[PDB]
Amino acid sequence: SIGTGDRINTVRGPITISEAGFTLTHEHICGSSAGFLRAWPEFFGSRKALAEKAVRGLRRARAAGVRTIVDVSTFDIGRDVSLLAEVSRAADVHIVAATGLWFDPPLSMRLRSVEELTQFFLREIQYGIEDTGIRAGIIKVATTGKATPFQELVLKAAARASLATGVPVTTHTAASQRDGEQQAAIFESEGLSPSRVCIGHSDDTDDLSYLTALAARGYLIGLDRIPFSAIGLEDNASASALLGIRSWQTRALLIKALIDQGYMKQILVSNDWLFGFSSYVTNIMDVMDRVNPDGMAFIPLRVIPFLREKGVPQETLAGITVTNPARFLSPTLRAS
Amino acid sequence: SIGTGDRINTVRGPITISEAGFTLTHEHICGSSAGFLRAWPEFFGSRKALAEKAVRGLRRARAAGVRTIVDVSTFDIGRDVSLLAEVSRAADVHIVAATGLWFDPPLSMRLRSVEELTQFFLREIQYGIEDTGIRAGIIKVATTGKATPFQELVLKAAARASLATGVPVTTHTAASQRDGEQQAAIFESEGLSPSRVCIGHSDDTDDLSYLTALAARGYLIGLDRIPFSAIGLEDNASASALLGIRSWQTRALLIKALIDQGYMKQILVSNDWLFGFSSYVTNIMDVMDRVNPDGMAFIPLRVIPFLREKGVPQETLAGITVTNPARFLSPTLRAS
Ligand SMILES: CCOP(=O)(Cc1ccc(C)cc1)OCC
Ligand SMILES: CCOP(=O)(Cc1ccc(C)cc1)OCC
Ligand SMILES: [Co+2]
Ligand SMILES: [Co+2]
Ligand SMILES: [Co+2]
Ligand SMILES: [Co+2]
């Protein structure tokens, strides 16, 4: 394999691999829908209030050592690159933007062909998002169980955009249903190297056999929902469905498990947090903020020390939070 | 009933009823999806090509006498009020913007309550769309057969928004399935006067019994797809499913039929045309433009003279294209 320039695109421009530092690979400034933030900002109180909450949150994460976050918000998750650039500059935290499609694509997207979708992803990566010139540094895709026909087209287009640019692919999965396996099958059918792929939401499942099997093939495993837990919220149907009833310690231990299995170079950790959330029931953000007041600082403030306490070498934790993200994000073209 | 000031909101500001003039009540500058035009303008060649196409088309309509069009494009149809204002000023054609929801709502909308939706519609009507200050002059809703639970919520919120502001409601229907009847039931259960409602795409059915019954109740009947015909394009499945196999003369004669039944004041006619179309198969726009090169001028150039030669009085035609639209669009509050 070869590189493209040894630089990673952020909403403030390109940065060197060394500048990325401690990186949270799966985060959101706002979980919404295309055009929603600009059409109904009052849903989040106001755009200004959302930005300020994001800035406060990112500063606290930065204080705990976080220097970069990857906002995996796609077009259909309502990604607003202007908001990202604004909060990034105010908080002095690098933010890598994404292209791709989540599981709520509109008609204008759902009817497109794989070639058309491939051009859209390439546009956002090479030309820039909208008319901002801000280039995406990662491709986001997803499935909720077996891939629908359209989702298959999306993953293929993601693989092609990836092979052409060197930008990695990260995914949302229904961990329990072992989605990672079908996703891997499609990606490989397109010639994409597993090292360019992160199977996300893997901590949503306790099946270590499924995880280690994917890791053995070269895929990066995303344990990105560590703080998700509805324990003590059994009475909240909606919160329970999204967060699950497994403790954050349970999720965190999968990190230690994979390390023991010898897959430390293939682990990526994150919170899957956000500061705004309109694509779900109202006030879910409030419920979430009560579950995890640390927000994005949860990983450095509670997960890292937890792992260290239970035997994981500090050096190994540095490798997972600094070295793996850097190697993953560095635009990398396959050997021709 | 009562007036709110006797002025209609357009993307260029409020105009007097007499300024409206010849009005096409169901049109689109571009049929897309929220955020789609801003993120992938190349799909339409470019934003500039799209705008120039709209300007050329609007000037041709204007040349034929059209002074105002109602763009019933909602948030989820990709409504871009900035584009509307730009083409309106360059073509010097009044454009009334819409709020409401079509049948492609994203998650951030689909999960909202009737109360929340009611606040969104009111925002767009009273405060304005996004941060432009441009206020919607009509509310658009839709169903395609029996109403889904969310759709029932949309209709109720649309009714509440209309009752509080005086702004009319216009609908998309699967005419052949008589959607109009259920829409009316929901509207009346909220206390909305039938005179504030236009049951659209009614020319899509040949069941005059269904149309006359609704007209007898006070509803306005939208015969807005007159030029839609896939005749001669039998080998084009997608074009046939959307355009139908009935001639434009057949659709147009429904205008005469309703007039003969004594419902001239209940009729509103339009083309349901657009200059860009991304929420359907690729190149459908090219197919449509061949079918009807007159675009929005189809009504004044072909339909009006056609009805005139079938015995319809010129004055009755003026009442339909000038008087009815004005009566319909003028904000009207129910008697205290
Ligand atoms: C290897 C030295 O760690 P680091 O480069 C980045 C770093 C800080 C905090 C945590 C919990 C992990 C990693 O130090 C910050 C200046
Ligand atoms: C008396 C009504 O005519 P009008 O106001 C508007 C109007 C123009 C064209 C056609 C086809 C019908 C109506 O004439 C334009 C100056
Ligand atoms: Co996800
Ligand atoms: Co996420
Ligand atoms: Co319609
Ligand atoms: Co329409």
XYZ file of C-alpha atoms and ligand atoms in Angstrom:
708
model
C 0.000 0.000 0.000
C 0.920 3.639 -0.447
C -0.249 6.962 0.902
C -1.738 10.077 -0.652
C 0.070 12.768 1.312
C 0.402 11.657 4.933
C -2.199 14.174 6.048
C -5.699 13.913 7.504
C -8.542 16.225 6.450
C -10.331 18.073 9.270
C -12.972 20.797 9.223
C -10.165 23.333 9.743
C -8.040 21.838 6.990
C -5.347 19.136 6.758
C -3.328 18.156 9.833
C -0.334 15.856 10.227
C -0.767 12.369 11.670
C 1.211 13.456 14.744
C -1.197 16.363 15.302
C -4.191 14.017 15.650
C -2.991 12.740 19.018
C -5.589 11.187 21.338
C -8.512 10.490 18.984
C -12.154 9.551 19.634
C -13.085 7.695 16.436
C -16.890 7.650 16.624
C -18.639 10.780 17.840
C -21.380 13.240 16.883
C -21.766 16.951 17.483
C -25.453 16.517 16.648
C -27.603 13.498 15.744
C -30.309 14.867 13.450
C -31.565 14.785 9.847
C -30.676 16.538 6.579
C -31.733 20.177 6.789
C -33.415 19.813 10.192
C -31.020 21.977 12.241
C -31.410 24.918 9.870
C -35.174 24.525 9.551
C -36.075 23.919 13.213
C -33.141 25.096 15.389
C -35.505 25.775 18.313
C -35.851 22.023 18.740
C -32.408 22.224 20.350
C -33.377 25.436 22.099
C -31.411 27.378 19.492
C -28.394 26.917 17.223
C -26.318 29.125 19.523
C -27.218 27.083 22.591
C -26.306 23.870 20.764
C -22.948 25.282 19.695
C -22.174 26.483 23.237
C -23.058 23.079 24.691
C -20.825 21.436 22.084
C -17.965 23.837 22.880
C -18.258 23.272 26.642
C -18.364 19.535 26.041
C -15.381 19.488 23.683
C -13.332 21.690 26.024
C -13.928 19.254 28.869
C -12.881 16.381 26.619
C -9.792 18.370 25.577
C -8.956 19.079 29.226
C -8.940 15.314 29.740
C -6.522 14.925 26.834
C -8.704 14.498 23.734
C -7.225 16.374 20.768
C -9.316 14.973 17.931
C -12.765 13.490 17.400
C -14.195 11.910 14.270
C -17.747 13.131 13.758
C -19.274 10.232 11.827
C -22.399 12.226 10.981
C -23.382 11.638 7.374
C -25.575 13.762 5.124
C -28.690 11.945 6.382
C -27.679 12.301 10.029
C -27.999 16.035 9.405
C -24.268 16.769 9.404
C -23.752 20.548 9.378
C -20.116 21.145 8.494
C -20.397 24.850 9.342
C -21.393 23.971 12.900
C -18.484 21.526 13.105
C -15.955 24.091 11.877
C -17.321 26.683 14.290
C -17.214 24.485 17.389
C -13.871 22.993 16.350
C -12.253 26.429 16.246
C -13.871 27.645 19.475
C -12.936 24.481 21.403
C -9.574 23.999 19.698
C -10.316 20.329 19.050
C -9.732 18.722 15.648
C -12.869 17.325 14.008
C -12.794 14.921 11.079
C -15.954 15.089 8.966
C -17.594 12.170 7.184
C -19.393 11.350 3.968
C -21.480 8.240 3.308
C -25.051 7.392 4.305
C -26.703 6.206 7.535
C -30.008 4.317 7.705
C -32.371 7.237 7.096
C -31.562 8.262 3.492
C -34.166 10.390 1.662
C -35.766 9.496 -1.686
C -33.230 11.519 -3.690
C -30.549 9.206 -2.254
C -32.430 5.869 -2.051
C -33.137 5.874 -5.781
C -29.531 6.461 -6.860
C -27.314 3.794 -8.438
C -24.019 2.561 -7.011
C -22.126 4.691 -9.570
C -24.114 7.801 -8.665
C -23.553 7.228 -4.944
C -19.851 6.659 -5.608
C -19.649 10.117 -7.213
C -21.381 11.739 -4.243
C -18.953 10.204 -1.715
C -15.991 11.190 -3.914
C -17.349 14.735 -4.181
C -17.470 15.188 -0.413
C -14.012 13.669 -0.014
C -12.196 15.425 -2.880
C -14.152 18.582 -3.725
C -15.661 19.187 -0.321
C -18.931 19.166 1.581
C -21.507 21.509 0.043
C -19.701 24.702 -0.997
C -17.383 24.913 2.021
C -14.326 23.198 0.592
C -14.237 21.124 3.779
C -13.170 17.601 2.812
C -14.477 14.450 4.493
C -11.784 12.312 6.085
C -13.849 9.144 6.514
C -16.770 7.214 4.983
C -19.714 6.171 7.158
C -22.168 3.358 6.288
C -24.727 1.202 8.130
C -27.131 -1.746 8.363
C -29.660 -2.889 10.995
C -29.556 -6.620 10.423
C -29.255 -8.109 6.936
C -28.441 -5.422 4.370
C -31.355 -4.074 2.345
C -30.783 -3.836 -1.416
C -30.019 -0.115 -1.150
C -27.619 -0.615 1.756
C -25.659 -3.103 -0.347
C -25.207 -0.382 -2.972
C -24.025 2.049 -0.286
C -21.329 -0.278 1.083
C -20.112 -1.000 -2.435
C -19.953 2.719 -3.244
C -18.168 3.241 0.072
C -15.592 0.601 -0.853
C -15.021 2.213 -4.242
C -14.701 5.738 -2.860
C -12.261 4.265 -0.334
C -10.089 2.434 -2.865
C -9.933 5.592 -4.987
C -9.027 8.022 -2.166
C -7.423 6.028 0.631
C -9.995 7.338 3.119
C -11.192 4.660 5.580
C -14.679 3.261 6.097
C -16.434 2.966 9.444
C -19.765 1.294 10.121
C -22.861 1.176 12.288
C -24.042 -2.397 12.885
C -26.633 -4.389 14.788
C -23.835 -6.101 16.704
C -26.142 -8.774 18.124
C -27.049 -9.857 14.587
C -23.376 -10.136 13.580
C -23.822 -7.562 10.793
C -20.055 -7.132 10.604
C -19.803 -10.426 8.732
C -22.064 -9.442 5.842
C -20.455 -5.991 5.672
C -17.012 -7.603 5.490
C -18.213 -9.938 2.733
C -19.397 -7.030 0.574
C -16.306 -4.886 1.208
C -13.980 -7.748 0.259
C -16.051 -8.456 -2.845
C -14.992 -4.951 -3.870
C -11.328 -5.569 -3.083
C -11.250 -3.325 -0.028
C -8.609 -4.180 2.564
C -10.033 -4.963 6.039
C -7.412 -2.628 7.528
C -9.359 0.275 5.993
C -12.531 -0.808 7.790
C -13.900 -0.401 11.291
C -16.903 -2.497 12.307
C -18.618 -0.177 14.765
C -20.955 -0.655 17.711
C -19.212 -3.952 18.375
C -19.474 -3.425 22.135
C -23.221 -3.815 21.635
C -22.560 -7.560 21.727
C -20.884 -9.936 24.190
C -20.070 -12.545 21.556
C -16.295 -12.581 21.645
C -16.175 -15.327 18.991
C -17.785 -12.937 16.505
C -15.432 -10.087 17.412
C -12.172 -12.056 17.433
C -13.090 -13.714 14.128
C -13.408 -10.290 12.510
C -10.215 -9.051 14.166
C -8.378 -12.135 12.902
C -9.313 -11.101 9.361
C -7.745 -7.662 9.775
C -10.779 -5.516 10.546
C -10.660 -2.787 13.152
C -13.183 -3.367 15.941
C -15.082 -0.337 17.142
C -15.965 -0.462 20.833
C -17.593 2.958 20.550
C -20.612 2.869 22.883
C -18.975 2.243 26.247
C -21.167 4.662 28.241
C -24.461 3.388 26.776
C -26.499 1.866 29.603
C -30.163 2.054 30.590
C -29.535 0.319 33.921
C -31.770 1.999 36.467
C -33.912 3.116 33.551
C -35.729 -0.179 33.082
C -38.888 1.941 33.293
C -37.941 3.903 30.140
C -38.825 1.731 27.135
C -37.255 4.013 24.512
C -34.051 4.666 26.473
C -33.716 0.957 27.215
C -34.053 0.030 23.544
C -31.267 2.399 22.487
C -28.856 2.134 25.436
C -29.279 -1.505 26.427
C -29.177 -3.081 29.876
C -25.479 -3.965 29.962
C -23.192 -1.937 32.251
C -20.411 0.266 30.919
C -17.974 -1.999 32.738
C -19.244 -4.973 30.734
C -18.717 -3.106 27.455
C -15.313 -1.853 28.623
C -14.090 -5.368 29.422
C -14.466 -6.406 25.776
C -11.590 -4.001 25.185
C -9.455 -5.945 27.658
C -10.639 -9.249 26.180
C -9.528 -8.357 22.655
C -6.197 -7.157 24.030
C -5.687 -10.504 25.762
C -6.540 -12.274 22.487
C -3.681 -10.277 20.990
C -5.658 -7.747 18.939
C -4.602 -4.467 20.543
C -3.594 -2.901 17.207
C -7.164 -3.413 15.971
C -9.166 -1.712 18.678
C -10.751 1.718 18.330
C -12.603 3.174 21.313
C -15.189 5.967 21.549
C -18.382 7.158 23.270
C -20.828 7.628 20.371
C -21.907 10.771 22.199
C -23.590 13.911 20.857
C -24.800 17.280 22.108
C -28.066 17.381 20.162
C -30.305 14.441 19.183
C -33.492 14.948 17.122
C -33.669 11.635 15.257
C -35.169 9.921 18.315
C -37.792 10.499 21.019
C -37.895 13.993 22.510
C -35.643 14.669 25.503
C -33.533 11.548 24.909
C -30.529 13.896 25.116
C -31.551 14.806 28.680
C -31.842 11.142 29.625
C -28.432 10.435 28.075
C -26.728 13.387 29.743
C -27.924 12.097 33.132
C -26.602 8.602 32.388
C -23.201 9.984 31.390
C -22.462 13.564 32.623
C -18.871 13.175 31.406
C -20.089 13.051 27.823
C -17.157 12.565 25.468
C -14.670 12.769 28.347
C -16.048 9.436 29.568
C -13.367 7.387 27.816
C -10.320 9.227 29.197
C -11.879 9.935 32.595
C -13.353 6.568 33.451
C -12.635 3.865 30.860
C -8.849 4.256 30.568
C -8.278 4.181 34.340
C -10.697 1.252 34.643
C -8.709 -0.782 32.145
C -5.414 0.199 33.741
C -6.723 -0.900 37.126
C -7.730 -4.288 35.795
C -4.302 -5.051 34.372
C -3.996 -3.275 31.015
C -0.577 -1.616 30.471
C -0.695 2.182 30.177
C 1.478 1.876 27.059
C -1.148 -0.351 25.452
C -3.840 2.220 26.191
C -1.742 4.904 24.490
C -1.438 2.661 21.456
C -5.185 2.143 21.268
C -6.172 5.799 21.695
C -3.323 7.383 19.732
C -1.540 4.932 17.429
C -4.509 2.958 16.099
C -6.617 6.030 15.178
C -3.637 7.629 13.414
C -2.940 4.511 11.336
C -6.655 4.099 10.592
C -7.301 7.704 9.482
C -4.088 8.238 7.484
C -5.300 8.175 3.870
C -3.906 4.883 2.580
C -4.079 3.586 -0.994
C -3.754 -0.132 -1.711
C -0.614 -1.515 -3.331
C -1.114 -1.391 -7.091
C -64.801 34.138 8.684
C -62.159 36.807 9.258
C -59.107 38.177 7.478
C -55.609 38.501 8.943
C -54.765 41.551 6.850
C -55.807 40.540 3.371
C -52.285 39.984 2.060
C -50.535 36.884 0.770
C -46.974 36.022 1.798
C -44.569 35.409 -1.109
C -40.824 34.755 -1.045
C -40.365 38.459 -1.882
C -42.723 39.600 0.863
C -46.471 40.288 1.199
C -48.536 41.182 -1.872
C -52.160 42.314 -2.165
C -54.817 39.900 -3.405
C -55.138 41.838 -6.629
C -51.384 41.522 -7.225
C -51.653 37.717 -7.340
C -53.474 37.703 -10.675
C -53.322 34.576 -12.852
C -52.137 31.974 -10.332
C -50.951 28.364 -10.780
C -51.746 26.746 -7.421
C -49.686 23.542 -7.449
C -46.146 23.807 -8.818
C -42.510 23.158 -7.903
C -39.259 24.846 -8.792
C -37.455 21.640 -7.880
C -38.612 18.267 -6.561
C -35.843 16.950 -4.320
C -35.119 16.120 -0.666
C -34.051 18.179 2.347
C -30.431 19.284 2.039
C -30.019 17.504 -1.296
C -29.638 20.577 -3.525
C -26.977 22.124 -1.266
C -24.987 18.896 -0.944
C -25.162 17.493 -4.476
C -25.933 20.371 -6.882
C -24.131 18.606 -9.729
C -27.043 16.152 -9.848
C -28.906 18.956 -11.597
C -25.828 19.971 -13.580
C -25.208 22.812 -11.135
C -27.236 25.141 -8.945
C -26.712 27.845 -11.574
C -27.994 25.731 -14.467
C -31.018 24.740 -12.407
C -31.786 28.358 -11.501
C -31.384 29.532 -15.100
C -33.699 26.745 -16.247
C -36.304 27.831 -13.704
C -35.984 31.482 -14.748
C -36.421 30.656 -18.453
C -39.450 28.530 -17.617
C -41.026 31.101 -15.308
C -40.557 33.889 -17.846
C -42.262 31.770 -20.499
C -45.158 31.162 -18.119
C -45.227 34.894 -17.345
C -45.233 35.670 -21.065
C -48.428 33.606 -21.307
C -50.036 35.560 -18.472
C -48.961 33.762 -15.288
C -48.205 36.266 -12.523
C -48.001 33.921 -9.549
C -47.208 30.302 -8.766
C -47.554 28.402 -5.528
C -44.528 26.211 -4.935
C -45.982 23.455 -2.764
C -42.527 22.013 -2.071
C -42.198 21.219 1.621
C -39.180 20.727 3.873
C -38.919 17.075 2.827
C -39.379 17.876 -0.873
C -36.101 19.770 -0.522
C -37.658 23.237 -0.609
C -34.840 25.799 -0.885
C -36.483 29.149 -0.197
C -33.301 31.000 -1.239
C -33.576 29.438 -4.696
C -37.252 30.382 -4.816
C -36.512 34.021 -3.933
C -33.713 34.215 -6.487
C -35.737 32.858 -9.398
C -38.800 34.874 -8.377
C -36.865 38.143 -8.599
C -35.079 37.299 -11.851
C -38.248 36.062 -13.575
C -40.429 38.656 -11.868
C -43.034 36.043 -10.944
C -44.599 35.906 -7.480
C -43.898 32.611 -5.687
C -45.812 31.524 -2.587
C -43.762 29.187 -0.394
C -45.152 26.250 1.579
C -44.653 24.566 4.923
C -46.020 21.175 5.974
C -44.750 17.690 5.147
C -44.857 15.488 2.045
C -44.493 11.696 2.188
C -40.723 11.439 2.628
C -40.237 12.783 6.169
C -36.912 11.938 7.867
C -36.596 10.518 11.407
C -36.391 13.919 13.101
C -39.873 14.667 11.743
C -41.470 11.187 11.795
C -40.961 10.894 15.557
C -42.546 14.243 16.448
C -45.937 14.637 18.134
C -48.884 16.526 16.666
C -48.062 19.394 19.069
C -44.430 19.590 17.978
C -45.360 19.456 14.285
C -47.947 22.187 14.842
C -45.195 24.403 16.240
C -42.968 23.719 13.241
C -45.682 24.649 10.723
C -46.487 27.798 12.705
C -42.789 28.713 12.775
C -42.521 28.569 9.004
C -45.720 30.572 8.629
C -45.264 33.279 11.261
C -41.522 33.427 11.959
C -40.335 32.310 8.555
C -38.466 29.489 6.865
C -35.036 28.852 8.358
C -33.527 32.279 9.103
C -34.748 34.051 5.977
C -37.883 35.696 7.311
C -39.669 34.253 4.279
C -43.101 33.184 5.534
C -45.037 30.248 4.072
C -48.356 31.125 2.462
C -49.761 27.586 2.347
C -49.604 24.211 4.135
C -48.901 21.024 2.176
C -49.753 17.516 3.413
C -50.090 14.112 1.746
C -51.243 10.479 1.782
C -50.984 7.657 -0.777
C -53.946 5.509 0.111
C -55.083 5.139 3.729
C -53.241 7.515 6.068
C -50.326 6.154 8.083
C -50.398 7.003 11.797
C -47.798 9.731 11.252
C -49.741 11.137 8.330
C -52.845 11.480 10.501
C -50.705 13.559 12.874
C -49.514 15.732 10.002
C -53.075 16.408 8.808
C -54.202 17.409 12.299
C -51.213 19.695 12.817
C -51.845 21.193 9.392
C -55.440 21.888 10.429
C -54.384 23.465 13.700
C -51.771 25.610 11.949
C -54.427 26.715 9.428
C -57.025 27.543 12.086
C -54.538 29.728 13.994
C -53.146 31.576 10.961
C -55.823 31.529 8.271
C -53.429 29.968 5.773
C -54.974 27.341 3.454
C -54.123 23.641 3.265
C -53.451 21.805 0.006
C -52.991 18.052 -0.379
C -51.397 15.309 -2.457
C -53.686 12.309 -2.956
C -53.881 8.890 -4.556
C -57.049 10.136 -6.243
C -57.991 6.749 -7.701
C -58.201 5.461 -4.108
C -60.345 8.365 -2.902
C -57.836 9.582 -0.277
C -59.717 12.880 -0.343
C -62.520 11.401 1.736
C -60.332 10.398 4.659
C -58.362 13.655 4.484
C -61.642 15.561 4.753
C -62.795 13.477 7.716
C -59.633 14.281 9.655
C -59.712 17.951 8.658
C -63.319 18.365 9.778
C -62.645 16.518 13.043
C -60.312 19.427 13.837
C -62.914 22.032 12.931
C -61.228 23.157 9.721
C -63.566 24.679 7.148
C -63.587 22.743 3.837
C -63.223 26.102 2.050
C -59.670 26.278 3.443
C -58.759 22.966 1.811
C -57.758 21.906 -1.686
C -57.868 18.190 -2.474
C -55.057 17.800 -5.004
C -54.181 15.455 -7.874
C -57.900 14.959 -8.303
C -57.519 14.816 -12.078
C -55.732 11.491 -11.521
C -59.156 9.834 -11.217
C -62.084 9.447 -13.602
C -64.530 9.000 -10.730
C -66.529 12.211 -11.028
C -68.868 10.930 -8.306
C -65.976 11.139 -5.853
C -65.029 14.659 -6.951
C -68.546 16.134 -6.975
C -69.324 14.788 -3.501
C -66.228 16.524 -2.096
C -67.054 19.694 -4.014
C -70.605 19.661 -2.622
C -69.098 19.767 0.874
C -67.135 22.940 0.192
C -63.720 21.535 -0.685
C -61.687 22.992 -3.504
C -60.749 20.444 -6.163
C -57.216 20.551 -7.499
C -57.006 19.469 -11.144
C -53.266 20.057 -11.055
C -51.647 17.373 -13.241
C -53.266 18.118 -16.618
C -50.109 17.635 -18.737
C -49.219 14.305 -17.061
C -49.433 11.608 -19.730
C -47.201 8.646 -20.536
C -48.992 7.978 -23.826
C -46.423 7.006 -26.432
C -43.976 5.987 -23.711
C -45.520 2.586 -22.991
C -42.066 0.992 -22.849
C -41.050 3.304 -19.984
C -42.348 1.659 -16.801
C -41.222 4.393 -14.386
C -42.610 7.204 -16.556
C -45.909 5.306 -16.896
C -46.348 4.737 -13.158
C -46.015 8.462 -12.437
C -47.629 10.036 -15.508
C -50.444 7.572 -16.176
C -51.915 6.521 -19.529
C -54.751 9.061 -19.692
C -54.487 11.973 -22.152
C -54.246 15.602 -21.084
C -57.579 16.242 -22.814
C -59.206 13.660 -20.541
C -57.795 15.316 -17.419
C -58.765 18.749 -18.767
C -62.345 17.705 -19.512
C -62.789 17.064 -15.785
C -62.500 20.849 -15.444
C -65.447 21.242 -17.827
C -67.325 18.430 -16.089
C -67.085 20.097 -12.686
C -68.062 23.407 -14.263
C -71.146 21.798 -15.818
C -72.042 20.370 -12.391
C -72.048 23.942 -11.082
C -68.742 23.920 -9.161
C -66.646 26.487 -11.047
C -65.803 28.381 -7.841
C -64.438 25.108 -6.437
C -61.827 24.486 -9.075
C -58.095 25.197 -9.051
C -55.940 24.107 -11.983
C -52.179 23.684 -12.344
C -49.403 21.600 -13.989
C -47.549 20.117 -11.007
C -44.432 20.907 -13.025
C -40.842 21.383 -11.902
C -37.464 22.309 -13.372
C -35.447 19.770 -11.369
C -36.521 16.319 -10.120
C -34.195 14.169 -7.955
C -36.690 12.270 -5.801
C -37.408 9.825 -8.654
C -35.522 7.796 -11.280
C -32.611 9.601 -12.957
C -33.478 11.598 -16.078
C -37.212 11.655 -15.394
C -36.974 15.416 -15.899
C -35.764 14.874 -19.485
C -38.668 12.512 -20.161
C -41.180 14.980 -18.705
C -39.822 17.935 -20.665
C -40.337 15.964 -23.900
C -43.886 15.100 -22.905
C -44.574 18.762 -22.147
C -42.091 21.347 -23.517
C -44.478 24.131 -22.484
C -43.868 23.270 -18.843
C -45.849 25.609 -16.588
C -47.163 27.500 -19.625
C -49.141 24.374 -20.549
C -52.219 25.629 -18.700
C -52.509 29.074 -20.371
C -51.249 27.965 -23.798
C -53.152 24.693 -24.248
C -55.728 24.000 -21.535
C -57.446 27.400 -21.470
C -57.950 27.511 -25.279
C -59.008 23.858 -25.244
C -61.741 24.431 -22.666
C -62.716 27.598 -24.496
C -63.329 25.598 -27.670
C -65.358 23.025 -25.758
C -67.834 25.746 -24.845
C -66.443 27.026 -21.542
C -66.999 30.801 -21.186
C -63.838 32.918 -21.125
C -65.041 34.636 -17.954
C -65.574 31.315 -16.177
C -61.961 30.556 -17.083
C -60.857 33.879 -15.596
C -62.775 33.103 -12.424
C -60.988 29.775 -12.130
C -57.432 31.006 -12.698
C -57.720 34.392 -10.985
C -60.664 34.578 -8.589
C -60.549 31.116 -7.003
C -56.782 31.215 -6.269
C -57.118 34.671 -4.676
C -60.069 33.564 -2.534
C -58.164 30.413 -1.562
C -54.782 31.986 -0.694
C -56.088 35.008 1.228
C -55.497 34.138 4.915
C -58.909 33.537 6.499
C -59.675 32.897 10.192
C -62.937 31.183 11.179
C -65.663 33.530 12.431
C -65.328 34.446 16.107
C 1.787 8.802 25.592
C 1.560 10.154 26.284
O 0.116 10.480 26.268
P -0.374 11.689 25.564
O 0.458 11.997 24.187
C -1.963 11.503 25.112
C -2.903 10.862 26.093
C -3.475 11.609 27.117
C -4.489 11.064 27.911
C -4.835 9.724 27.794
C -5.701 9.077 28.834
C -4.172 8.944 26.854
C -3.221 9.512 25.999
O -0.222 12.772 26.560
C -1.024 14.010 26.439
C -0.106 15.180 26.154
C -59.686 39.412 -16.955
C -58.532 38.475 -16.607
O -57.408 38.700 -17.544
P -56.055 38.975 -17.015
O -56.076 39.983 -15.722
C -55.328 37.578 -16.493
C -55.292 36.409 -17.437
C -54.350 36.357 -18.458
C -54.302 35.267 -19.326
C -55.296 34.295 -19.294
C -55.155 33.044 -20.109
C -56.280 34.381 -18.315
C -56.267 35.418 -17.383
O -55.341 39.558 -18.171
C -53.890 39.849 -18.091
C -53.660 41.352 -18.111
Co -24.584 4.282 14.978
Co -22.929 7.134 15.942
Co -48.012 15.473 -5.272
Co -46.572 18.430 -6.580
